[PDB]
């Protein structure tokens, strides 16, 4: 109640500063609450700037595809449907 | 070369226009301290220091591509807040006044 | 030749330094530094430093040197003394140019000079990197890394700039 | 220091792929799917040997597979392909998104005539594994022997004999 | 450092920029990565007194990559001999 | 070394000599101080760029930022000196002999 | 170790005795500091502030 | 100054020093010096008078010039080694510049001219920071780059500082100038032993800081800045004259006082290295310092100078300055010789 | 609307980058031969210009190590026409 009548005063007298503090407050808080923030790291990771150097096949790499179109390896199906 | 040619043409043409402006047939036969406020000096210094912080912020469009987004965002917001803090300090210390 | 553009720029760079280091009126000394700053950007641009070069214009020339000129107009000079009207400035100015010219004349002729230390004269192009075909600016990648690797650099730099505001207000209060 | 060995001028001759960048750009996605095996064998060699002189034979097999790849487009899909890379070639940035209509015609032609399937988003950036009979390099950096470490100190820490022994002090 | 707080706390304040063979954005290598890498590994853990003599070969190679003073001196020598011979008409550059 | 290093090293020396050979205006010495920084920035950028030492690319910016903040402090002291004696001449700063 | 006042290996050594003559001297120096504290502030040197 | 701002500025001074002492990267070392200088100027200016403005200006120019030379050495080192690690330098020209840059920061002769003037022009509390805390950062760098330092250069700087500091102090009546020349002489001893045993540099540094802090604190307690002002202390605070007497004799290196220990340990290290002429010359030259310490003891403690009538009013009021840590510092300034072997904690 | 469009633009960038990755083996193979041809050509010129200079070995390395070392510009174009060197050196920086 004491804070409520404080906000009314600043809103009437310093609306520009109230907007500034509110906008800046949202910028610091919303990334922790947004459910899309995790896709920002995934998309950045998925972008291949440098060449993907192939590994030497030792016969003990069941999770490493032998060909780009093979079913092993990271997928971007989640990104297409994003 | 193209850019240097562009710059040369722009300032060479500027030089030519300025000299022909100064020349034409006229058809005629016959170190101290300014009385200037310290406030204006403080505007220049304040601009300079903020201009230095804007230099630190310019890389942000590239920095947003990093995979270390958690660190990137925290430091980006940290720099802007401190810039806001210095503005708040000047404001409360009567540094943005003219009376 | 165009292959020597960097060397040519570095020669002008030195003359600009002799210009303001002989210390004419700080109005002209500031002008000599502005020209050196612009040439300094040109040198940095030709080594692939696009972003770094433009920071010289934006920050060094458009920021610091504007304030230098601004302060000169208030607290140092309003009218300038005739350039080279002082014997000491002219003597220093002539002394520097001749030293610079003798350095340039010999290096060009021999493709190498020994001014105290050994310097080559084949051209700056010879030390350049030969193979490059990444799809990005490496110079831009490094500067962007300030926000992911240089957490410590940001904190201390950010703190120092805030302190600069506090300190300058204390200094000027009286 | 010695003499830098270099392969002979005729040890470097090969049939070059003399097509423009917009042709390669237009064919890149099918090219990456079709010529992966020699391509990855060559790139494995380069990152392992760190010496271009050591992968010249595998580099030649890269050209042969690419020339064979393009001879196979020229033999079945010449006209749909020319339309496509000519649309790519028009753009100053050689954008894919401006040519989806011509891309589909080329994609359908290779699929019908050569069973070629365009790799999906993300495929060509995968890290794959390669089988090579080339032995794994032993000393790729050609590094000398490392200096021996200093004699490590091991033992029981006893009190200093008679203390500091500084001038007259007894402790 | 005078006080090695970084090692003792296990926090990296500035070691990441100290050398050019450390991790870089997008694995971009420096031009002298292999030379610095070799010299660092030779000189690791033996002290600068020993390293100045026992890793001299690596440091000499590394310094050559950094400043290329020998390489330029050799090219300057071949350039001298050509534009001399060209005057005595004893050499004809290829097409 | 390369040609450019000759002239860049020379520019630093010229501005250093200029700084150590004062005239009258304090501003003239602050300019020589900022000329030294300019040549340092150019010398470091050239070295860092040529060697492709990527993470060091931010170093010249940090140098520029701190130096400019350092130049701001110098200008503040110049105006305070100028507010006391009416000029920025360094021969007025001799009370502490 | 690095930047450690007393590394772990130092625990093999016998501890200084609480009756160490050097430790008594250090205690004496502390007592002297207490007296000089009283003197500079013009308190009764011996009796003032026994807690201090 | 607002008390909160003063604390923040003091912490920035400390943080700038700490950054220098914990950095493994030359850029961060340079940043530490820049930060430290930025925050030290306001405390020199805090009384707003022309002498304070002159001192801050002379300080700014000297430190700024030195920091430029430090950066030049760092870049030359980068050119010839391709790395930024804080340690020995890899070019002799870089070593000379860095050594001269740090000598300029420390105020060693013949880059000493600023120390007496800046100290005289700033308050006693600012002079205390200038002549004690500000030595930590340059000395901590010298501690790490000493293997690459030119021996002739560093010993020449040391000998000149002991000579200049000793001779300069003889002509002084101002207490802040006396302390300034005392500082120059003591930096000379610290750097003379650096090539041989850096631990003795730290020992001399710490002991010097303790005694210098003691003297500045006792000068502040009575608001004395001149020899004659200090000669009134006997008729106000007799105890303080005894403490001043003991501390000055300690700073003179007289046994059995704490200030003998650093001179004694330094002589030992150089003799172990077959250096006999240099320690002997330094010890004899240090008698110049002992002379103008003794002069102060004569006017302060061992004789009673004339007083003034208005002094009787001061008898009625207590000493209300904080005098923080003075009882501890004065005891350590004088009575530590029996604990000399404890110098190994610095090893 | 900006989120939808920027997400699509990221997918388009990945497709463009993957096209580059598919071609890099072919471009890398071509580059190796070009560098080695240019070094072999410079060697033949050296063997003739310095054919009997007192004590001049031909093709001697300046490095103690035998590891392959990437040549710099001067070692590749050191004896070639100026316009090729301008284009090879400053061409990219000047294209703008
Ligand atoms: C606690 C307890 O109950 O038992 C402790 C102890 C019993 O221990 P302990 O194992 O049985 O052996 C004791 C033996 O007496 C001692 O056994 P110790 O074998 O350990 O021998 C003592 C040894 C231990 O190591 C030490 O160094 C301790 C130093 C003892 C204090 C000496 C400082 C006073 C100097 C004399 C004046 O001392 C040394 O090795 C160094 C020699 C010190 C010579 C003194 C001068 C050295 C500096 C030169 C400048 C000063 C000149 C004189 C002033 O009882 C004590 O003797 C008390 C210690 C003495 C110091 C505390 C009292 C303060 C004295 C103030 C003197 C005022 C001076 C006036 C001017
Ligand atoms: C082994 C080598 C040779 C020996 C090396 C020894 C090195 C020195 C050892 C440390 C010496 C610390 C000073 C001794 C304590 C004297 C002060 C005292 O007892 O007053 C009680 C003190 C206040 O007494 P006071 O009447 O206001 O004035 C006392 C002196 O005049 C206050 O005089 P002040 O204006 O100089 O106050 C300075 C003190 C501020 O005074 C205090 O607040 C007492 C702090 C004592 C800290 C104990 C340090 C030892 C423990 C290390 C862990 O600064 C500190 O906080 C010291 C940290 O009461 C407390 O605060 C108890 C501590 C609560 C926490
Ligand atoms: C080893 C000793 C090292 C010095 C110890 C520290 C000195 C402590 C004594 C002191 O400082 O006070 C002197 C005191 C003066 O007497 P008082 O009438 O109480 O006046 C004080 C008003 N607050 O005197 C007193 O009345 C208290 C009784 C103790 C006095 C000790 C005298 C010290 C003399 C030291 C001389 C050097 C010794 C060698
Ligand atoms: C071991 C040495 C311990 C040194 C302790 C020194 C404590 C400070 C001196 C005690 C005397 C009273 C005092 O607190 O000093 C005053 C001074 C603050 O300034 P003041 O003028 O009193 O008021 C400020 C408002 N304008 O206080 C200050 O500004 C603090 C300045 C001294 C800090 C540097 C001390 C030397 C470095 C210590 C590191 C040791 C290694
Ligand atoms: C143990 C190992 C270490 C060995 C090294 C030696 C350590 C000793 C040095 C300790 C540090 C100095 C502290 C000395 C304490 C002095 C306190 C004292 O004795 O009384 C001072 C006296 C009292 O004055 P006040 O209290 O203000 O009023 C008196 C009214 N009753 O004030 C007066 O009345 C003024 C009297 C006139 C001045 C006389 C000066 C000559 C006496 C000086 C003695 C101290 C000399 C210290 C040098 C070391 C001695 C060996
Ligand atoms: C009798 C004479 C002996 C008394 C000595 C007492 C000194 C205080 C005890 C500290 C003991 C210690 O562990 O410090 C020693 C330390 C070692 O020096 P270092 O550079 O770290 O490397 C050593 C390798 N030889 O080096 C040091 O600590 C000494 C250097 C002191 C510099 C003061 C820096 C103060 C910074 C404090 C920051 C926090 C603010 C308080
Ligand atoms: C929500 C988090 C988002 C991040 C925001 C970034 C941090 C920025 C920090 C700025 C701090 C400014 O803090 C501000 O200080 C002044 C002090 O005068 C206060 O204002 C007070 O002082 C002024 C004097 O000018 C009075 O007129 C006013 O009546 C009084 O309330 C404000 O109540 C407060 O808003
Ligand atoms: C005066 C100093 C002022 C300093 C102010 C600093 C403000 C910092 C505010 C936000 C900092 C972190 O901002 C955001 O927080 C959330 C908290 O989980 C992080 O976490 C979020 O993204 C990650 C990325 O995968 C997800 O795995 C996670 O599920 C999600 O919660 C974000 O990755 C980070 O971008
Ligand atoms: C005046 C204010 C003073 C306040 C001082 C507060 C101290 C702040 C400490 C900052 C450094 C924290 O510790 C450091 O943080 C960064 C980012 O999180 C980490 O760095 C991380 O980002 C990049 C990504 O590769 C790399 O540097 C490194 O691979 C990674 O670990 C370091 O691994 C960690 O050691
Ligand atoms: C206050 C004045 C400031 C002016 C600053 C002017 C810039 C100074 C540039 C110094 C950079 C060149 O520094 C110098 O380079 C050459 C080139 O290998 C080095 O090499 C030279 O000395 C050593 C001596 O054994 C050997 O390398 C070699 O015999 C010799 O050529 C020098 O040891 C080095 O000191």
PDB file of N, CA, C and O in Angstrom, chain E residues 8-27:
ATOM      1  N   UNK E   8      45.358 -20.057  -7.334  1.00  0.00           N
ATOM      2  CA  UNK E   8      44.964 -20.556  -6.024  1.00  0.00           C
ATOM      3  C   UNK E   8      43.449 -20.656  -5.915  1.00  0.00           C
ATOM      4  O   UNK E   8      42.926 -21.575  -5.275  1.00  0.00           O
ATOM      5  N   UNK E   9      42.729 -19.720  -6.528  1.00  0.00           N
ATOM      6  CA  UNK E   9      41.276 -19.766  -6.580  1.00  0.00           C
ATOM      7  C   UNK E   9      40.746 -20.523  -7.787  1.00  0.00           C
ATOM      8  O   UNK E   9      39.535 -20.742  -7.875  1.00  0.00           O
ATOM      9  N   UNK E  10      41.608 -20.926  -8.714  1.00  0.00           N
ATOM     10  CA  UNK E  10      41.136 -21.593  -9.917  1.00  0.00           C
ATOM     11  C   UNK E  10      40.211 -20.734 -10.750  1.00  0.00           C
ATOM     12  O   UNK E  10      39.187 -21.222 -11.243  1.00  0.00           O
ATOM     13  N   UNK E  11      40.544 -19.458 -10.911  1.00  0.00           N
ATOM     14  CA  UNK E  11      39.747 -18.522 -11.693  1.00  0.00           C
ATOM     15  C   UNK E  11      40.655 -17.890 -12.734  1.00  0.00           C
ATOM     16  O   UNK E  11      41.783 -17.494 -12.422  1.00  0.00           O
ATOM     17  N   UNK E  12      40.172 -17.805 -13.966  1.00  0.00           N
ATOM     18  CA  UNK E  12      40.957 -17.310 -15.091  1.00  0.00           C
ATOM     19  C   UNK E  12      40.582 -15.852 -15.326  1.00  0.00           C
ATOM     20  O   UNK E  12      39.569 -15.555 -15.960  1.00  0.00           O
ATOM     21  N   UNK E  13      41.407 -14.941 -14.815  1.00  0.00           N
ATOM     22  CA  UNK E  13      41.166 -13.513 -14.968  1.00  0.00           C
ATOM     23  C   UNK E  13      41.759 -12.961 -16.255  1.00  0.00           C
ATOM     24  O   UNK E  13      41.128 -12.138 -16.921  1.00  0.00           O
ATOM     25  N   UNK E  14      42.955 -13.397 -16.618  1.00  0.00           N
ATOM     26  CA  UNK E  14      43.622 -12.841 -17.786  1.00  0.00           C
ATOM     27  C   UNK E  14      44.573 -13.810 -18.471  1.00  0.00           C
ATOM     28  O   UNK E  14      45.214 -13.412 -19.443  1.00  0.00           O
ATOM     29  N   UNK E  15      44.693 -15.057 -18.011  1.00  0.00           N
ATOM     30  CA  UNK E  15      45.597 -16.007 -18.650  1.00  0.00           C
ATOM     31  C   UNK E  15      45.155 -16.366 -20.060  1.00  0.00           C
ATOM     32  O   UNK E  15      45.979 -16.822 -20.858  1.00  0.00           O
ATOM     33  N   UNK E  16      43.878 -16.170 -20.378  1.00  0.00           N
ATOM     34  CA  UNK E  16      43.335 -16.547 -21.677  1.00  0.00           C
ATOM     35  C   UNK E  16      43.892 -15.710 -22.824  1.00  0.00           C
ATOM     36  O   UNK E  16      43.866 -16.171 -23.967  1.00  0.00           O
ATOM     37  N   UNK E  17      44.381 -14.497 -22.564  1.00  0.00           N
ATOM     38  CA  UNK E  17      44.941 -13.656 -23.613  1.00  0.00           C
ATOM     39  C   UNK E  17      46.467 -13.668 -23.618  1.00  0.00           C
ATOM     40  O   UNK E  17      47.072 -13.027 -24.478  1.00  0.00           O
ATOM     41  N   UNK E  18      47.107 -14.394 -22.702  1.00  0.00           N
ATOM     42  CA  UNK E  18      48.548 -14.232 -22.517  1.00  0.00           C
ATOM     43  C   UNK E  18      49.340 -14.746 -23.714  1.00  0.00           C
ATOM     44  O   UNK E  18      50.383 -14.179 -24.056  1.00  0.00           O
ATOM     45  N   UNK E  19      48.885 -15.822 -24.352  1.00  0.00           N
ATOM     46  CA  UNK E  19      49.616 -16.424 -25.458  1.00  0.00           C
ATOM     47  C   UNK E  19      48.676 -16.623 -26.637  1.00  0.00           C
ATOM     48  O   UNK E  19      47.457 -16.708 -26.487  1.00  0.00           O
ATOM     49  N   UNK E  20      49.270 -16.704 -27.825  1.00  0.00           N
ATOM     50  CA  UNK E  20      48.503 -16.785 -29.057  1.00  0.00           C
ATOM     51  C   UNK E  20      48.107 -18.204 -29.436  1.00  0.00           C
ATOM     52  O   UNK E  20      47.276 -18.371 -30.331  1.00  0.00           O
ATOM     53  N   UNK E  21      48.655 -19.222 -28.779  1.00  0.00           N
ATOM     54  CA  UNK E  21      48.268 -20.602 -29.038  1.00  0.00           C
ATOM     55  C   UNK E  21      47.186 -21.093 -28.086  1.00  0.00           C
ATOM     56  O   UNK E  21      46.824 -22.270 -28.138  1.00  0.00           O
ATOM     57  N   UNK E  22      46.667 -20.224 -27.224  1.00  0.00           N
ATOM     58  CA  UNK E  22      45.544 -20.584 -26.377  1.00  0.00           C
ATOM     59  C   UNK E  22      44.272 -20.661 -27.214  1.00  0.00           C
ATOM     60  O   UNK E  22      44.262 -20.369 -28.408  1.00  0.00           O
ATOM     61  N   UNK E  23      43.182 -21.075 -26.577  1.00  0.00           N
ATOM     62  CA  UNK E  23      41.907 -21.179 -27.273  1.00  0.00           C
ATOM     63  C   UNK E  23      41.488 -19.823 -27.820  1.00  0.00           C
ATOM     64  O   UNK E  23      41.542 -18.814 -27.115  1.00  0.00           O
ATOM     65  N   UNK E  24      41.056 -19.803 -29.074  1.00  0.00           N
ATOM     66  CA  UNK E  24      40.651 -18.593 -29.765  1.00  0.00           C
ATOM     67  C   UNK E  24      39.235 -18.748 -30.302  1.00  0.00           C
ATOM     68  O   UNK E  24      38.751 -19.869 -30.490  1.00  0.00           O
ATOM     69  N   UNK E  25      38.532 -17.642 -30.541  1.00  0.00           N
ATOM     70  CA  UNK E  25      37.184 -17.734 -31.113  1.00  0.00           C
ATOM     71  C   UNK E  25      37.178 -18.495 -32.429  1.00  0.00           C
ATOM     72  O   UNK E  25      37.956 -18.205 -33.337  1.00  0.00           O
ATOM     73  N   UNK E  26      36.277 -19.469 -32.528  1.00  0.00           N
ATOM     74  CA  UNK E  26      36.079 -20.254 -33.744  1.00  0.00           C
ATOM     75  C   UNK E  26      37.358 -20.953 -34.189  1.00  0.00           C
ATOM     76  O   UNK E  26      37.556 -21.205 -35.377  1.00  0.00           O
ATOM     77  N   UNK E  27      38.229 -21.284 -33.240  1.00  0.00           N
ATOM     78  CA  UNK E  27      39.446 -22.041 -33.519  1.00  0.00           C
ATOM     79  C   UNK E  27      40.301 -21.373 -34.589  1.00  0.00           C
ATOM     80  O   UNK E  27      40.983 -22.044 -35.360  1.00  0.00           O
TER      81      UNK E  27
END
